[PDB]
CSV table of C-alpha atoms and ligand atoms in Angstrom, one decimal:
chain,number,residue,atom,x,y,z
A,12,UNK,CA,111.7,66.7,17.0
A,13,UNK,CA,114.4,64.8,18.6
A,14,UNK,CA,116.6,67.0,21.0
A,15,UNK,CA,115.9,69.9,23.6
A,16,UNK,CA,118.9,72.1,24.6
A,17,UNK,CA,118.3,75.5,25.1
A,18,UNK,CA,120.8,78.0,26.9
A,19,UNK,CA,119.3,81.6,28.0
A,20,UNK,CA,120.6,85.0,28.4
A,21,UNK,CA,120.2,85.5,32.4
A,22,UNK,CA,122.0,81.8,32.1
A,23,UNK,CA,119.3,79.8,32.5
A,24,UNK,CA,119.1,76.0,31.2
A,25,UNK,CA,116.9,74.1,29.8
A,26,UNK,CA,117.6,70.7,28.5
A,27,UNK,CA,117.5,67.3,28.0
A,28,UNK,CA,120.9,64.9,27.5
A,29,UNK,CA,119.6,61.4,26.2
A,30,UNK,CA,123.4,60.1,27.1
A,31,UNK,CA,122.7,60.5,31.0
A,32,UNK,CA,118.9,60.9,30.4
A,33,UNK,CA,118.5,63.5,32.4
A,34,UNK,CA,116.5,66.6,32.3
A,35,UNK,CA,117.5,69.8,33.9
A,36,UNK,CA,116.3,73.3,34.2
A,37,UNK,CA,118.8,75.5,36.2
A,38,UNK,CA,119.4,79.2,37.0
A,39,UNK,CA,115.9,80.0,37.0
A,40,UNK,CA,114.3,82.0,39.5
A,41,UNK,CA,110.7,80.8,39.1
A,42,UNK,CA,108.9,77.9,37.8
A,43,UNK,CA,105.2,77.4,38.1
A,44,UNK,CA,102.9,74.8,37.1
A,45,UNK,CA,99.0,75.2,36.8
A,46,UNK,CA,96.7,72.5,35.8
A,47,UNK,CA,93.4,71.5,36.2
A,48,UNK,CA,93.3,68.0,37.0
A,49,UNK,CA,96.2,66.2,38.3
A,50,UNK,CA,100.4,66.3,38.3
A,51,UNK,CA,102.4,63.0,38.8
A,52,UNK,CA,105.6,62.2,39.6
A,53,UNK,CA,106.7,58.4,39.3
A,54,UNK,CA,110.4,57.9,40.6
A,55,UNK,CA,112.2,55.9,43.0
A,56,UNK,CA,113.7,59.0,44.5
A,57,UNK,CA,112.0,62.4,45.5
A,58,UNK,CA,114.2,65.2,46.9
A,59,UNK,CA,112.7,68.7,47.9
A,60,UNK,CA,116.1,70.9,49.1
A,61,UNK,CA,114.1,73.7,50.6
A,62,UNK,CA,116.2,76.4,52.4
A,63,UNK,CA,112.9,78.5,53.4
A,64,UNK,CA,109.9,76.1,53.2
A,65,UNK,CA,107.3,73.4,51.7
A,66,UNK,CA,103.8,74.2,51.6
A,67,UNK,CA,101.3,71.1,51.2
A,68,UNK,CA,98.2,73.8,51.1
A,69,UNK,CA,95.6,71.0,50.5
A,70,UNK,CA,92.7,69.7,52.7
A,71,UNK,CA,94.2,66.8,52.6
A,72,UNK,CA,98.2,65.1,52.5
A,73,UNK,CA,98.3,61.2,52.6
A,74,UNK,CA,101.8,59.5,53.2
A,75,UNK,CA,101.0,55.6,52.5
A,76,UNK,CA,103.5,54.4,54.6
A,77,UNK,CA,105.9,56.1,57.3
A,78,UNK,CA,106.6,59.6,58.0
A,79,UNK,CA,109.5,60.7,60.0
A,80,UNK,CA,110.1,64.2,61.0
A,81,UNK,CA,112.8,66.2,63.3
A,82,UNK,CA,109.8,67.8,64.9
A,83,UNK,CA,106.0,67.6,65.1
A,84,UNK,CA,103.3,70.5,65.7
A,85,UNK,CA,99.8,69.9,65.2
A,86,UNK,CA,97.2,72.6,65.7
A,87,UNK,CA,93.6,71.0,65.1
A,88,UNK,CA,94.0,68.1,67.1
A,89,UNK,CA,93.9,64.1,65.4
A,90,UNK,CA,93.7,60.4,65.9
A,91,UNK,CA,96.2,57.6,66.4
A,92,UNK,CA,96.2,54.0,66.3
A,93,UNK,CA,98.1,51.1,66.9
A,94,UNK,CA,100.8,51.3,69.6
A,95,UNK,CA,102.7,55.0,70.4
A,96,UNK,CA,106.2,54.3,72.0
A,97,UNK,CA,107.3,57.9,73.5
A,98,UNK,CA,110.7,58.0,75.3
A,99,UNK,CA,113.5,60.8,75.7
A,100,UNK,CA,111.4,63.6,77.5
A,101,UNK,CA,108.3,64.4,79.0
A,102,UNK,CA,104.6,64.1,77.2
A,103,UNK,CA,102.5,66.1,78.6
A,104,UNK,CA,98.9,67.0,78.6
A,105,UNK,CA,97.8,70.4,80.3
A,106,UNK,CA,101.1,70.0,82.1
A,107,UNK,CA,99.9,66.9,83.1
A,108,UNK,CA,103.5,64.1,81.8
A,109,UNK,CA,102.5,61.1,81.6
A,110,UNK,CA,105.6,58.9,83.1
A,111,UNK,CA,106.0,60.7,85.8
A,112,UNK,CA,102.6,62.1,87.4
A,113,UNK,CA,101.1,61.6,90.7
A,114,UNK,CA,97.5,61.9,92.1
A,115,UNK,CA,95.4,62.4,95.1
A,116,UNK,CA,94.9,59.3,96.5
A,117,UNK,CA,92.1,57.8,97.9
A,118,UNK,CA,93.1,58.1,102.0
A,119,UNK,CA,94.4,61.7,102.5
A,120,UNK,CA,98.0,61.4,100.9
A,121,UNK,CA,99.7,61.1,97.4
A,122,UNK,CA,100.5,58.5,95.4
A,123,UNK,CA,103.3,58.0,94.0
A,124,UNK,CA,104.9,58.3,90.4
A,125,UNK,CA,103.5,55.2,87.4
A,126,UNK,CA,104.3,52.2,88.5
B,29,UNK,CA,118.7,77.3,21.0
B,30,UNK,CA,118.2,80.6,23.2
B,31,UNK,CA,114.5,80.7,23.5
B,32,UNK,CA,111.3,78.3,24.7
B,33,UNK,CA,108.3,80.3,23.8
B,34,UNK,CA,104.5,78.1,23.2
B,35,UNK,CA,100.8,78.9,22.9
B,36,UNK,CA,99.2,75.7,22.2
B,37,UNK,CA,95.6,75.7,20.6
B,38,UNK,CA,94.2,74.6,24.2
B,39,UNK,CA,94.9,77.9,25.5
B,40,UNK,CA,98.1,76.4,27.4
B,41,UNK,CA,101.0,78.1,27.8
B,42,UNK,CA,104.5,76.7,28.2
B,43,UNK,CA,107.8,78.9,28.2
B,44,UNK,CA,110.8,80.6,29.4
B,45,UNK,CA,110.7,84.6,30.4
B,46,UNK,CA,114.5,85.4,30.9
B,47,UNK,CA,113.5,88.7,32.0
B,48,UNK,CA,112.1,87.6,35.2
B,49,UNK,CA,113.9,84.3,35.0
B,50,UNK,CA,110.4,82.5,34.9
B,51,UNK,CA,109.3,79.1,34.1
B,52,UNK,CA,105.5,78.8,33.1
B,53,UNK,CA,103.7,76.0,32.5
B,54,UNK,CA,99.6,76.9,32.6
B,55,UNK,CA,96.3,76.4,31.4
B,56,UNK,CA,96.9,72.2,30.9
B,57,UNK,CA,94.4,69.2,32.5
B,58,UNK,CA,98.0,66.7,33.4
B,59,UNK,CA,101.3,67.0,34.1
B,60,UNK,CA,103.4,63.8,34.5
B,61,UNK,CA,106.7,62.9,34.9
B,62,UNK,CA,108.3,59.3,35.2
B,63,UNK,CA,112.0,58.7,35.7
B,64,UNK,CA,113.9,55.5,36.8
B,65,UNK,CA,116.6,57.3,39.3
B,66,UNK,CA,115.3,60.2,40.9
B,67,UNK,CA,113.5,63.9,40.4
B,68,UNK,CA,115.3,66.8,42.7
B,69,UNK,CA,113.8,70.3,43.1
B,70,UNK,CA,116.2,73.0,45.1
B,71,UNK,CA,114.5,76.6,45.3
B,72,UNK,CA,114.0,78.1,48.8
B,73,UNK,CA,110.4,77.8,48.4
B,74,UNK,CA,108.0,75.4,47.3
B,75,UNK,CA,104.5,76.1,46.6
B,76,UNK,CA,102.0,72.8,46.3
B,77,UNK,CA,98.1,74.3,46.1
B,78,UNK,CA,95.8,71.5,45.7
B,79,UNK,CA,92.5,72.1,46.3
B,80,UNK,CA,91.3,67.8,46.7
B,81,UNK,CA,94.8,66.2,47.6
B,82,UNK,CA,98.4,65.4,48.0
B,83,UNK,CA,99.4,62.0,47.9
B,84,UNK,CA,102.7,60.6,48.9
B,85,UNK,CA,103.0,57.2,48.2
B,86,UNK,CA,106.0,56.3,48.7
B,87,UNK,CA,107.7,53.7,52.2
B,88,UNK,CA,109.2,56.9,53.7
B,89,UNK,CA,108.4,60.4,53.7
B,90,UNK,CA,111.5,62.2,55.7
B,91,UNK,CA,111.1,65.8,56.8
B,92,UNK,CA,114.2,66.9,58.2
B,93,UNK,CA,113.2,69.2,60.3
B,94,UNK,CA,110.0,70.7,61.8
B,95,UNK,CA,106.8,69.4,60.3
B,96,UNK,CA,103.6,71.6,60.7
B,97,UNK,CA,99.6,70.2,60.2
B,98,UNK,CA,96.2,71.2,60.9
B,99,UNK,CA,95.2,67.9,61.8
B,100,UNK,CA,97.1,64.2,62.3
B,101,UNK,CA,95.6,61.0,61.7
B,102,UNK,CA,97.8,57.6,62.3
B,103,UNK,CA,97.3,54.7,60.9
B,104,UNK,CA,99.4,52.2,62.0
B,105,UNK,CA,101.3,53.3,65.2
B,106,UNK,CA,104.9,55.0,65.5
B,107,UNK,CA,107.6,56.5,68.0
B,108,UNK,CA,108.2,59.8,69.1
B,109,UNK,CA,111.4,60.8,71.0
B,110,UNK,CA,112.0,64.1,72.7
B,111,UNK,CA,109.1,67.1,75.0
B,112,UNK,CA,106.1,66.4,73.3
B,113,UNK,CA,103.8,68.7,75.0
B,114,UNK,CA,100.1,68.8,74.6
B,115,UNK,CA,97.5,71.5,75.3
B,116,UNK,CA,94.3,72.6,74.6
B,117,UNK,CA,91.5,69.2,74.6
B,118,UNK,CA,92.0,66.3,75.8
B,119,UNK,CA,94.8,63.3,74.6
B,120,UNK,CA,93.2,60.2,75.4
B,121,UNK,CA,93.7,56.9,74.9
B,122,UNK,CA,91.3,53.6,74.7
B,123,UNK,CA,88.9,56.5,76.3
B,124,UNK,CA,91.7,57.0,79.2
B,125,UNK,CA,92.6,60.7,79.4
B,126,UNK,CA,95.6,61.8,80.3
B,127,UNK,CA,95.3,64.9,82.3
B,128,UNK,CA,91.8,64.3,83.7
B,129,UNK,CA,91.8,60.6,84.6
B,130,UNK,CA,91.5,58.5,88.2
B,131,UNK,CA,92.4,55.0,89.7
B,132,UNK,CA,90.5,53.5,91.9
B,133,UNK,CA,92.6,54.3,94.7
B,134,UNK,CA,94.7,51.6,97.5
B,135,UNK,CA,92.3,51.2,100.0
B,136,UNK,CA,88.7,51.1,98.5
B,137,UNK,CA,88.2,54.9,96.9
B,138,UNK,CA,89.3,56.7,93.7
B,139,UNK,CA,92.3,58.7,93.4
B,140,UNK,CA,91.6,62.7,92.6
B,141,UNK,CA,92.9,63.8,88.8
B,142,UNK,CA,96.6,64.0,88.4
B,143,UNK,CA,98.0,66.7,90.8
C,13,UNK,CA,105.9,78.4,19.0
C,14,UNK,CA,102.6,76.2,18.8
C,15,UNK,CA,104.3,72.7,19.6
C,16,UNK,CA,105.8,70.6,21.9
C,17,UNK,CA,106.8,66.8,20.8
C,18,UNK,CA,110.0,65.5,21.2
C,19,UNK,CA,111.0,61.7,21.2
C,20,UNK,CA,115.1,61.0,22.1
C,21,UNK,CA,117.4,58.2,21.0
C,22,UNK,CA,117.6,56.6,24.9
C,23,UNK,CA,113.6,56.3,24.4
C,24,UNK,CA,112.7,59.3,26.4
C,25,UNK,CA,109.2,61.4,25.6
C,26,UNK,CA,109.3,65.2,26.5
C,27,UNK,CA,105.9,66.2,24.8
C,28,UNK,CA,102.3,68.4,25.3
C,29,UNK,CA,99.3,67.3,23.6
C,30,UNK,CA,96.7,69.6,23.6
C,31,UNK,CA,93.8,67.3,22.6
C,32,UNK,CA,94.0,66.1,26.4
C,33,UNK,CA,95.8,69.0,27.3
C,34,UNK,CA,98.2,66.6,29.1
C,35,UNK,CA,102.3,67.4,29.6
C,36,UNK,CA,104.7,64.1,29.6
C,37,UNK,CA,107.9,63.0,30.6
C,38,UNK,CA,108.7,60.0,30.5
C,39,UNK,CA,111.4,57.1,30.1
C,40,UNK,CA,114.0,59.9,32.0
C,41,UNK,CA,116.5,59.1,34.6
C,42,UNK,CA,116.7,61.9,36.7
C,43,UNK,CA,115.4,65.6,36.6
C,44,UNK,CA,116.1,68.7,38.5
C,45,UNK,CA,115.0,72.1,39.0
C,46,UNK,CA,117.0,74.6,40.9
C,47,UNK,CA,115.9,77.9,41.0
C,48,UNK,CA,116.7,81.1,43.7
C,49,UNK,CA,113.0,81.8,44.4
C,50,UNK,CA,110.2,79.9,44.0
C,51,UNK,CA,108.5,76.6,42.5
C,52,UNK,CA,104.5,76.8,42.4
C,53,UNK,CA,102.1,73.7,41.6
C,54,UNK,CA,98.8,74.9,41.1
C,55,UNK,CA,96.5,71.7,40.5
C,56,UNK,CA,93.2,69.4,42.3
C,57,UNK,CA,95.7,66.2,42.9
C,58,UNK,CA,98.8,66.1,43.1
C,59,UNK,CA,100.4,62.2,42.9
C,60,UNK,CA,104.3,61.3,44.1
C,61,UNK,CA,105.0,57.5,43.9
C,62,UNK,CA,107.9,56.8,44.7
C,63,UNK,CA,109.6,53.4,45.6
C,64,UNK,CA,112.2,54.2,48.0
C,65,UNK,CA,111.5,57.8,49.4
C,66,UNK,CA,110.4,61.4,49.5
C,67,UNK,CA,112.8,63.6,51.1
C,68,UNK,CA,111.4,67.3,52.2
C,69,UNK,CA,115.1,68.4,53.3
C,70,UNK,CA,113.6,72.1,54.3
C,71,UNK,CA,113.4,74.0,57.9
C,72,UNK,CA,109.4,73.5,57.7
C,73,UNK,CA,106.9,71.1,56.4
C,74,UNK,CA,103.4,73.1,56.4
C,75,UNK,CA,100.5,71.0,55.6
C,76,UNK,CA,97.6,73.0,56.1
C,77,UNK,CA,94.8,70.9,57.0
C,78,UNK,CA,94.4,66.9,57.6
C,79,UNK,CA,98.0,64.9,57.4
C,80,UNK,CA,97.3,61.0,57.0
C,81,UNK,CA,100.3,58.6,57.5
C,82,UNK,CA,100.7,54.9,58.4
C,83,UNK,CA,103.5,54.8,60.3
C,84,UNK,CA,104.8,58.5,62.7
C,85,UNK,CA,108.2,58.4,63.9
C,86,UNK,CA,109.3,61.8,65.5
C,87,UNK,CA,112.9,62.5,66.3
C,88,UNK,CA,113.4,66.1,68.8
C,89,UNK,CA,110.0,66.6,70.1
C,90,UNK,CA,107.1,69.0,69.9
C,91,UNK,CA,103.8,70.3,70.4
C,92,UNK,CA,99.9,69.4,69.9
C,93,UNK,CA,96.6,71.1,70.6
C,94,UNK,CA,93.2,70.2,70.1
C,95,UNK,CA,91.7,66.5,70.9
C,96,UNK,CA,94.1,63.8,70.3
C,97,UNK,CA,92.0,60.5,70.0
C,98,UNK,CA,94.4,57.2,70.7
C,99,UNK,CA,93.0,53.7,69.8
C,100,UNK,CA,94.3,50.1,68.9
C,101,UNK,CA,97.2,49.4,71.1
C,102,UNK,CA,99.4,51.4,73.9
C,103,UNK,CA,100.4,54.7,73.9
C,104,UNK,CA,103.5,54.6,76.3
C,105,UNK,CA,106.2,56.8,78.0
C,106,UNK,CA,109.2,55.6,79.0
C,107,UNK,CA,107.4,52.6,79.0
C,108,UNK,CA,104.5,54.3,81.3
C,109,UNK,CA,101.1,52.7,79.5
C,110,UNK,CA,98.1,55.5,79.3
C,111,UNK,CA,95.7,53.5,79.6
C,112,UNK,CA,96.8,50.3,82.0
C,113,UNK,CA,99.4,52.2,84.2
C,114,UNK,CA,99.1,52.2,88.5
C,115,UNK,CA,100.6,53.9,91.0
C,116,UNK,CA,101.7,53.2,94.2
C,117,UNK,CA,98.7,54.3,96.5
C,118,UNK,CA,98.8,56.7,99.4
C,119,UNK,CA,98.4,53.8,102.3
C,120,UNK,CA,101.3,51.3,101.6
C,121,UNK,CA,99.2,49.3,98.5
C,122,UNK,CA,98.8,50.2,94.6
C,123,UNK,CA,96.2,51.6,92.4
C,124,UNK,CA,93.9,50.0,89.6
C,125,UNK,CA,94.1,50.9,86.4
C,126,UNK,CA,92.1,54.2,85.0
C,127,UNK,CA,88.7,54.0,85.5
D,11,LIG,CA1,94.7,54.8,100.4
D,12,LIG,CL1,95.5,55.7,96.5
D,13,LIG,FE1,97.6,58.0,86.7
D,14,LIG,NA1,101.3,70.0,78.4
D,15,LIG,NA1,90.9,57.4,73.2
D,16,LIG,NA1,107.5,54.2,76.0
């Protein structure tokens, strides 16, 4: 057919207005998609509004550009390339922060801080 | 209408339950969907189970707030702001490690690890 | 029903086809879900391209294995464990290099770089 515009008894929507062209499903409680090859989405804009939680359970997520986030945990350890600028804070390593360490030095005494 | 209800000859499904307020969409090879403005999904949890991959391609991928991985792999470099505090191996760089590494010292001898 | 083929007056396809089992959308503007539980992708690949952004607006981001990005830019901090391998440049902070950075010694001089 030609149009898609369904309305639900627990209030649910499902539709589709060609004058906005926008699809929208609303006042659901579950949706679910199972395939067994690929899903795509091709948009300018993706927004996830997630009050609990997004789960990437995959071996394997690839962002092909940048990735920002408020804050970083990794479990398994990594690699990185090209140059790392950390300010604002300590990094540390086994307690070990890196602008601000000192070490034995080679004559009896401490050195002092990084240069 | 008031109902979305479809057994295809594929064995897919594709419906509405109102009962449970469920959206089902199973037993398909692809999904796509391409839009010119933008695709929005807000639900308090998102479930992505892939068993080869996630791909994100895209300039920015923004996660607002904490961001959790197995393992990290950069590409091309970055910033990090705030306590970034590393345990458990070793965070090197260009073979240089940060909480076992010396200097050869001021006057002739090497430095002990950082204190 | 045993159907799914739609075709709108602003060009838009909703449609299944179950000789390639594939689901389409396409020539949409927007689309949203909003639902009060859950939304599940079950699927090998999943593929976002998206010209301007991705936006995971949630308290956590969980990928479960390997995270690839080009670019990292972290805002508030946080944690790693396991070996984290830096190459290709400087990993620095507050502007302290890893792998170039001296001390002052412990007998009035300064220290090389790491060994
Ligand atoms: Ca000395
Ligand atoms: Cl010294
Ligand atoms: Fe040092
Ligand atoms: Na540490
Ligand atoms: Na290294
Ligand atoms: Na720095």
């Amino acid at each position: 057919a030609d149009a898609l515009h369904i309305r639900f008894p627990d209030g649910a929507v499902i539709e589709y207005e060609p004058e906005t062209s926008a699809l929208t499903v609303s006042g659901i409680k579950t949706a679910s998609v199972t395939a067994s090859g690929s899903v795509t989405a091709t948009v300018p804009v993706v927004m996830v509004k997630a009050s609990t939680r997004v789960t990437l359970d995959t071996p394997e997520v690839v962002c092909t550009n940048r990735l920002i986030t408020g804050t970083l945990e990794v479990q398994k350890g990594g690699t990185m390339r090209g140059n790392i600028e950390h300010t604002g804070g300590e990094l540390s390593s086994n307690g070990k922060v890196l602008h601000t360490h000192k070490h034995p030095g080679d004559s009896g005494g401490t050195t002092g801080s990084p240069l």
